[PDB]
Amino acid sequence: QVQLQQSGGGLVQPGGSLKLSCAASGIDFSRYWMSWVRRAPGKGLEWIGEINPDSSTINYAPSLKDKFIISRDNAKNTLYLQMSKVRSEDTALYYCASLYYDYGDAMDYWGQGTSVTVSSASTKGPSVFPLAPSSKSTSGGTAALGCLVKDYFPEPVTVSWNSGALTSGVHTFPAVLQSSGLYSLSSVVTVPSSSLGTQTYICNVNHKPSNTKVDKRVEPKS
């Protein structure tokens, strides 16, 4: 089993520095060319650079030579990306990948990816508000309810319902970046209208960057 285990990253200040790591297992790391690639929000993948087995060749995308240093430590089976003088444009998901040098710079194995956010803003936990089921909800039909997870930074949050016991009919939407620079998302669930008087519905929200955990009861309103 080939695996590239990435670590590092997170939220950094503009002008800050950050070192990403990529640990290889299941291959003879010291024989492989390695690459870094990233994807900014809403964009296509972009190559950052590559390094050969003994580090005597390091090639960079030209626009990025200034901000990125690629290195490797073969004894640790590890590849590194040092980021410096970062700006908000460097907010992206960063991947390491092995190169298929028997034929060319195709990328035959990919790490799981590391999220980096560059911003001057501080970590902020969300507020969690109920999306209460309508009182007009069709008699004997289907009701919708949810939780609005508002004003957090950086990504990600996670949402479960009834501590993971409720999964059918759940839709947790992608986060949106608000004009305030904070994220928001909603999680909804559809359930029988007849169950609103009996079953309790609780959305379990975690925001690990701020160490925020909210268990919000969602009740019909009076």
Binding site: D105, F173, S186
Partner: protein
């Protein structure tokens, strides 16, 4: 830099069909082209290299063709596990560059959205801001329009929407729209309405509430 252009960002298909994804390079890249598969919340997986050769383990129903500028990935007898995004890459010169990708979705019958509106909670209003949420649930196809009307006046610039990936079981989409207002503005209006148009609806569907009722 070489630009790799994928002429369709989205393709609808069906299990068992043949599907072809195209990729066009802005200048010749010989046969130095690779193809990748990527599914939501997963990393890419390599499929093709040297334009037409498979990586090991890749099923034979994936083939590739082309040389110079025009490249094609063909999937014969599409399987449900092949529903994914597909993107090309050139490795003829530096910088290495990638296509933006073509996402496959599964055709199903038209399904109108089930629409729900949610007033802001009392807890939120203490904050000074009000969010009004409109949910469009389990519809197909993905195209839908949501308009917000406050005291019957069409709103613009103060809503955002988000859409789920296609559901693996029932092949539908869901969509939320959030209208953001100050509490003070919220309290100055009576009627909040979400108006939805979709191919499955012969006329638009409106969900609304009067503030306070």
């Amino acid at each position: 830099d070489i630009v790799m252009t994928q002429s369709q960002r989205f393709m609808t298909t069906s299990v068992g069909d043949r599907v072809s994804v195209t990729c066009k390079a802005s200048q010749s890249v010989d046969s130095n082209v690779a193809w990748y598969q990527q599914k939501p919340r997963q990393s890419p997986k390599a499929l093709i290299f040297s334009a037409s050769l498979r990586f090991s383990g890749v099923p034979a129903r994936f083939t590739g063709s082309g040389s110079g500028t025009d490249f094609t990935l063909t999937i014969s007898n599409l399987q449900s596990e092949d529903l994914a995004e597909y993107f090309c890459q050139q490795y003829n010169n530096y910088p290495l560059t990638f296509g933006a990708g073509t996402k496959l979705e599964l055709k199903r019958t038209v399904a109108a959205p089930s629409v729900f509106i949610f007033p802001p909670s009392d807890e939120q209003l203490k904050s000074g801001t009000a969010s009004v949420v409109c949910l469009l649930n389990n519809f197909y196809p993905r195209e839908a329009k949501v308009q917000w009307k406050v005291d019957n006046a069409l709103q613009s610039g103060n809503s955002q929407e988000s859409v789920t990936e296609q559901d693996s079981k029932d092949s539908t989409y869901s969509l939320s729209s959030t209208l953001t207002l100050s509490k003070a503005d919220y309290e100055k209006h009576k009627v909040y309405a979400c108006e939805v148009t979709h191919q499955g609806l012969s006329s638009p569907v409106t969900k609304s509430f009067n503030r306070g009722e």
